[PDB]
Design a protein around this ligand. Structure first.
Ligand SMILES: CO[C@@H]1O[C@H](CO)[C@@H](O[C@@H]2O[C@H](CO)[C@@H](O[C@@H]3O[C@H](CO)[C@@H](O[C@@H]4O[C@H](CO)[C@@H](O)[C@H](O)[C@H]4NC(C)=O)[C@H](O[C@H](C)C(=O)O)[C@H]3NC(C)=O)[C@H](O)[C@H]2NC(C)=O)[C@H](O[C@H](C)C(=O)O)[C@H]1NC(C)=O
Ligand SMILES: [Ca+2]
Length: 273
């Protein structure tokens, strides 16, 4: 088969030496890499920019004529990644080279056969501050119809986090928006944890860190990201080959999802970043 799906809760991706490179989530679809040798025990695969090996034990072959394979498609305005059969995210503007309503396939969401995407928020250095003020960030709740969020009117706390820890406040708002459903998840409400801090795939709610209030949750999560990711040389969102997505989340499209939210906010607020 050309495509395989991950069966266990997570599965590792290995290099040719058998060293772990990353891990990916249950249901993730990987491509067989025909330029490298596979055998009975391990398949050469590609996922989210990463070329490595996976154990056959962890995979199930798909038939693309009847099983869901992630793809990209333009509506003529935006280019969308269907990350799941019933979920799409906008990743880029429509290019003239895209046929509307045609399915396109890509192992990294940047290289296509007939065009190349810029996803600049995916590779942006997150130590550079946003050009949005606290009041501008606060406006996005009304502009994107975000109701009942714990993060409403916390633009000033995001900008303090940025000032103190030197982490981009648009990124911190987009990460909390994606990870905690705009501070509306049960982890957000019970634990003031908007960033999935230690929300491990095996037991996400139980493992998730507890913070004292919303402001200490924003500041404490920012400290945790600075100390565990930025200070360790993971300074952009990226994918399974580089960036925070290598370690932060099993989801191969976590970085692309946060970049998409940054793109959507930036557009609504007038494109200052
Ligand atoms: C839109 O819904 C949201 O989707 C998000 C994905 O797009 C989803 O993300 C979930 O978030 C957490 C943080 O990203 C993430 O947790 C990581 O889990 C792995 C374990 O599976 C941790 O790695 C282990 O770490 C220990 C200690 O370091 C190691 O000993 C161990 O070997 C590691 N295991 C492996 C297999 O390598 C990882 O820890 C890293 C390495 C770390 O400590 O820095 C965890 N990350 C963090 C930051 O703690 C999890 O993978 C991810 N889930 C998916 C599918 O990606 C949101 O989840 C939230 C948290 C929630 O459910 O409320 C989704 N949000 C909602 C509202 O649904
Ligand atoms: Ca190696």
């Amino acid at each position: 088969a050309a495509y395989y799906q991950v069966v266990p809760v997570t599965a590792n991706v290995y290099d040719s030496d058998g060293e772990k490179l990353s891990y990916i989530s249950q249901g993730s679809v990987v491509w067989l890499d025909k330029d490298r040798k596979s055998d009975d025990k391990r398949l050469a695969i590609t996922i989210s920019g990463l070329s490595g090996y996976m154990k056959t034990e962890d995979l199930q072959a798909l038939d693309a004529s009847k099983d869901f394979i992630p793809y990209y498609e333009s509506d003529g305005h935006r280019f969308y990644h269907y990350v799941a059969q019933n979920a799409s995210i906008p990743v880029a503007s429509h290019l003239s080279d895209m046929e509307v309503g045609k399915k396109y396939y890509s192992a990294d969401g940047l290289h296509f056969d007939g065009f190349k995407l810029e996803n600049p928020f995916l590779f942006k250095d997150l130590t550079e501050a946003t050009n949005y003020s606290a009041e501008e960030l606060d406006k996005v709740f009304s502009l994107l119809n975000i109701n009942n969020s714990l993060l409403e009117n916390k633009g000033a706390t995001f900008k303090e986090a940025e000032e103190h820890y030197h982490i981009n406040a648009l990124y911190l708002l987009a990460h909390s928006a994606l990870e905690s459903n705009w501070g509306r998840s049960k982890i957000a409400k019970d634990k003031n944890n908007f960033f999935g801090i230690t929300a491990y795939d095996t037991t996400p709610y139980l493992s998730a860190k507890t913070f004292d209030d919303v402001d200490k949750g924003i500041l404490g999560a920012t400290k945790w990201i600075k100390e565990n990711y930025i200070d360790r040389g993971r300074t952009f969102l990226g994918n399974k080959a580089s960036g925070m997505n290598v370690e932060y989340a099993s989801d191969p499209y976590w970085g692309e999802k946060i970049a998409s939210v940054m793109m959507k906010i930036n557009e609504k607020l007038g494109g200052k970043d």
